[PDB]
Amino acid sequence: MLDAFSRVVVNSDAKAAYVGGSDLQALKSFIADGNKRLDAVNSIVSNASCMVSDAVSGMICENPGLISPGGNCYTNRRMAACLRDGEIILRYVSYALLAGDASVLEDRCLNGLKETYIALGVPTNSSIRAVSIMKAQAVAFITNTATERKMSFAAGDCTSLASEVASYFDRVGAAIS
Amino acid sequence: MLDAFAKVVAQADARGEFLSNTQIDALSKMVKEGNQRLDIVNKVTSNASAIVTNSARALFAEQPQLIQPGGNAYTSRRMAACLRDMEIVLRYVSYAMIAGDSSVLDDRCLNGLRETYQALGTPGSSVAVAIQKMKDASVALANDTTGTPIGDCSSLVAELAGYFDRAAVSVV
C-alpha cells in the first residue's frame, strides 16, 4: 500500500537518487492542496449511508428484474448483501482519496472482484450501473452541487479532486467489467 | 473503441436518453480546440524515434544491470523487444490524445500489462521509469511553438501528461 509520498520515493529508488530539486517542489504543492483533500474526504464520509441506499435503489429502478422472483437482489438475504457489497466499494474509494493513490483500492478490493462476481452469479452489468451512480454523487458532493444538501466550505475551487475521484470510480467499473 | 463523442452517446443509451443541450455544448468545446489537439499529436509522432531512443539510452545509464549479461535486455532478441515496447506505449498515448478519451489506451495496451511483465520476469518498476522519461520529453516538445500560432494550450498538455501518468502506474 502506497500513498502519494511513497510513490515518489519508489520512483527515486529505482535510479538510486536522493529526493530533491524539482520533485521536492512538486511535493510542496501537493501539501498546499492538502486541506482541500481533507475538506473533501469529510464531505463523502458524512453522506456515506445515503450515497449507498440511493445508488442501490437507482440500480433497481432501472432494472426491476433484480427484485423479481429469481433476481439477484430478490430475497432479504441477498438484498442485505448488495447493500454491503456496495458500501465496501465506497469505503475503499475513500481510502484512495485520502491517500491520494489508488494502490489500496486496486489490490484489496479490485483484484479478483470480477472472477468472484461471475462465480456467485452476480450481474456485472448492474454492478457497473450502481458504481456509476456513486460516481455522480461524489462529484456533486465535492463540487458542492448536490440538490439535496449543501455543505459549508471555504471559498475556492476543487475541480482537481473531482477529476481524481471520478478516475477512481471509473476504474472500479472497468475492473469488474 | 470509444472516442470522446462516443463516450457520452454510449452512456446515454444505457438509460435511453437524448443528449441534452448542456452536453452538446461541452462537446463543441472539443471541436473548438480542435486544431490545437492535432498539433500535440503531430509534434509527438514526428519526433517518435528521438523520444524513444533518447529515453532508452538514459534508462540503461541509470540501471546498468538491465544490459549486463544475464540481464533482462541482454541478447538482441530481448533488446529489440524492449525498444518496441516503449514505442507501443507512445503509440497508444498518441491514439488516446487524438480521441480525447483513454479508451483505446487502457483496453488494448494497458489492460493486463502489469501481469504480462510479471509472468515474464520483466521489472515493471524499470518500465515505469521509461514512461516517465518519454513523458517529459513529450511535454517539453508540446509547449514550444517553432512555427505555430502562439496561444494557451496548457489544458491539453495537462491531458497528455495524464495519459503518460496512467500508463506509468499501470505497469508496476
Partner: peptide, 18 residues
C-alpha cells in the same frame, strides 16, 4: 489510476511563473 503528485506538480508549473 492517476498520479496526484506528478499531476499536482505539472499544473502548478505552467500557471505559476518561474
Amino acid at each position: 489510476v492517476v498520479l496526484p503528485v506528478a499531476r499536482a506538480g505539472l499544473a502548478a508549473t505552467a500557471k505559476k511563473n518561474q
